[PDB]
Design a protein around this nucleic acid. Structure first.
Ligand SMILES: [Mg+2]
Ligand SMILES: [Mg+2]
Ligand SMILES: [Mg+2]
Ligand SMILES: [Mg+2]
Ligand SMILES: [Mg+2]
Ligand SMILES: [Mg+2]
Ligand SMILES: [Mg+2]
Ligand SMILES: [Mg+2]
Ligand SMILES: [Mg+2]
Ligand SMILES: [Mg+2]
Ligand SMILES: [Mg+2]
Ligand SMILES: [Mg+2]
Ligand SMILES: [Mg+2]
Ligand SMILES: [Mg+2]
Lengths: 116, 70, 151
RNA sequence: GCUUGAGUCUCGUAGAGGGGGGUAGAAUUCCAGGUGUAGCGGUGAAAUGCGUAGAGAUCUGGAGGAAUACCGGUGGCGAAGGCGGCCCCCUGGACGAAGACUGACGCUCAGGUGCGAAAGCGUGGGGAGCAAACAGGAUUAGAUACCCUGGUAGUCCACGCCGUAAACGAUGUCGACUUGGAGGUUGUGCCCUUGAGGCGUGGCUUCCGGAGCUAACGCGUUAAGUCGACCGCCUGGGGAGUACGGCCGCAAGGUUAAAACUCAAAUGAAUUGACGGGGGCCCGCACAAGCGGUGGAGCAUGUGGUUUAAUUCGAUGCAACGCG
């Protein structure tokens, strides 16, 4: 509904999952789809292919809004950092621009202790 | 690493330019570095150890410049 | 082996049709080093196949192959606590050998009377896309599709 | 008396040197909302945990505490410990050029005094993140551990206490002398800065090597070389830096510091192998790709056992068991 024309794609790439959320330019979320909810539970949702399917399903569920342009805002590391954007072009959207947002502290909070 | 897609352009050109911007900014290196706490005594030792390699390996190829192998 | 590279042997074509693709089929089907009692099984089942349906004996056999050839398959490898299965492509020469091995192995499990009759039934089902020799082809294609992330 | 040691004055240079006070941006967490749906998080794999009371994601507003990405560099400063955003106030040391001045005022230093990471202690604040103790979930034969989900003291501030670290170039301070090379950083002099230049001279510092020294490894003008002055310490391993005593401390404990008994060794560097859940390269039916078997059934045969008057003796991981 409401026939939104311009949207924003928020790819929350991580080392363990990938959450794709398509919002309008004002931040309101219109629909979402993750990698682990796509039938890729376990060690298959880390893979960059599982994140591609998330971009496909998130391209759906916004069919009603009829978006025609997308800005991609990638966040974090992880395999689903590249294979998600190209699936948002193979899904028929137009990528107006790509912006990398990522929390990089200027030596702020103390990170967790090293794994052994 | 913001990349704006210009006019009269392909897409795979833009995506390759996005990686180049991100690789030049060292985003993934910084994220991987800040994952766990590196003790100050291991951050200083890891810096001097990697500079010792930088010096010797440059002087190792110099001693190997004035040799014939066969 | 780990060092040498071996050139494949030469196989004499069958007497009845002169086709080397069938000559391997009687080799794979033969057990116990007796070509004479196996070439009878292959020839009888081809006449039963051609007479029952389709045109000719050489094209009736080829159609049965085409449905059961695998185009992709998994090759297992181990990484950590468990084992992974990366999918790989099949070279055309291996594609044929995998097809005839599946047909014969899936014709020995049928409950019919004679192997000449079980084989003729299986080449029929393979052409019409039924049976259990084509089910294995779909199984292999599924194991490659379910692990497509591990390419 | 003297100025070649030491120090004072004039002019500049560089610097995370120290104490106090403000301020900036990124990020984590929390609080109040909007959109929005069924998952999020985690792992080698899972589960505990959070979520349909609507989490995770995304946008807006706010409050808080801690640390200062890039610059950043075997770079700089400090006696050592140590010091990293930006600005102001107070302040110590170093170095260089040309002069002037004092005229041995110097070096070391038992007791003594001061400074001294982190943890820890006391009183009062603060508390985002992280995280001893603690609880749960896994792994496991067990796992009061590593791994995961949470989490209190502590980490932060003011003022006192503690006084120890692999407090380490395992190398006390000061002075003189003794072939070289390539660098870093910071001043200065001369000339064609006439053009990203050339030649000298000082301070500090990283690397490689010469004579020499060293048990060897190695040090090598910043000596572990050649000498002089002063101080601290050592005298086989264990018991033991322990007991008792003294001093110190709120406590934890620190410092000074033995003996009986016991062994003939303990130790350093290097050498040849072997080994590694260290690395690289290569091979073998070693694996992978396939075919047919053994393990189940009946029988043959050999061997362990039990049996018996004897069930003759031998071989008994691979490399004994249809073997002598
Ligand atoms: Mg973690
Ligand atoms: Mg002194
Ligand atoms: Mg003293
Ligand atoms: Mg402290
Ligand atoms: Mg306290
Ligand atoms: Mg308190
Ligand atoms: Mg000591
Ligand atoms: Mg130290
Ligand atoms: Mg010492
Ligand atoms: Mg040397
Ligand atoms: Mg004591
Ligand atoms: Mg005492
Ligand atoms: Mg048996
Ligand atoms: Mg015997």
């Amino acid at each position: 509904r409401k026939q939104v024309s311009d949207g924003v794609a928020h790819i929350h790439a991580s080392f363990n999952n990938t959450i794709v959320t398509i919002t309008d330019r004002q931040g309101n979320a219109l629909g979402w789809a993750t990698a682990g909810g796509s039938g890729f539970r376990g060690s298959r949702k880390s893979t960059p292919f599982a994140a591609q399917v998330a971009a496909e399903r998130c391209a759906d569920a916004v069919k009603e809004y009829g978006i025609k342009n997308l800005e991609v805002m990638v966040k974090g590391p992880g395999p689903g950092r590249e294979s998600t954007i190209r699936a948002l072009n193979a899904a028929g959207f137009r990528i107006t621009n790509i912006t990398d947002v990522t929390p990089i502290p200027h030596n702020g909070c103390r990170p967790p202790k090293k794994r052994r | 690493p913001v990349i704006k897609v210009r006019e009269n352009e392909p897409f795979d050109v833009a995506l390759r330019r996005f990686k180049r911007s991100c690789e030049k900014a060292g985003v993934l290196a910084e994220v991987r570095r800040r994952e766990f706490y590196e003790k100050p005594t291991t951050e200083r030792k890891r810096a001097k150890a990697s500079a010792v390699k930088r010096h010797a390996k440059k002087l190792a190829r110099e001693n190997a410049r004035r040799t014939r192998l066969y | 082996p780990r060092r040498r590279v071996i050139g494949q042997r030469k196989i004499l074509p069958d007497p009845k049709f002169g086709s080397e693709l069938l000559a391997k089929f009687v080799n794979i089907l033969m057990v116990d080093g007796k070509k004479s009692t196996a070439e009878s099984i292959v020839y009888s089942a081809l006449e039963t196949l051609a007479q029952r349906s389709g045109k000719s004996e050489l094209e009736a056999f080829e159609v049965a192959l085409e449905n059961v050839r695998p185009t992709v398959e998994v090759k297992s490898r181990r990484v950590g606590g468990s084992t992974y299965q990366v999918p790989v492509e099949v070279r055309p020469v291996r594609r044929n050998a995998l097809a005839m091995r599946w047909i014969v192995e899936a014709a020995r499990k049928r409950g019919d009377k004679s192997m000449a009759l079980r084989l003729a039934n299986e080449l029929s089902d393979a052409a019409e896309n039924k049976g259990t020799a084509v089910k294995k082809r779909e199984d292999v294609h599924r194991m490659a599709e379910a692990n497509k992330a591990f390419a």
